[PDB]
Amino acid sequence: KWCFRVCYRGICYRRCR
Protein backbone atom coordinates (compact mmCIF):
# COMPACT_ATOMS: atom_id res chain seq x y z
CA LYS A 1 0.00 0.00 0.00
CA TRP A 2 1.19 3.60 -0.65
CA CYS A 3 -0.51 7.03 -0.39
CA PHE A 4 1.96 9.79 0.60
CA ARG A 5 5.70 9.12 1.13
CA VAL A 6 8.21 11.99 1.66
CA CYS A 7 12.04 11.84 1.90
CA TYR A 8 14.62 14.37 3.21
CA ARG A 9 18.43 14.60 3.95
CA GLY A 10 18.34 11.12 5.55
CA ILE A 11 14.73 10.55 6.73
CA CYS A 12 11.48 9.68 4.88
CA TYR A 13 7.76 9.70 5.76
CA ARG A 14 4.80 7.32 5.14
CA ARG A 15 1.15 8.35 5.72
CA CYS A 16 -2.07 6.95 4.17
CA ARG A 17 -5.64 8.38 4.16
UniProtKB/Swiss-Prot annotation:
Report the portion of the entire protein shown.
24 to 40 of 77
Family assignment from sequence similarity = Belongs to the tachyplesin/polyphemusin family.
Protein name from the UniProt record = Tachyplesin-1
Q: Where in the cell is it found?
A: Secreted
Tell me, in a sentence or two, what this protein's role is: Significantly inhibits the growth of Gram-negative and Gram-positive bacteria.
Disulfide pairs here are C3-C16, C7-C12
Where are the Arginine amide modifications?
R17
Tissue expression pattern: Hemocytes.
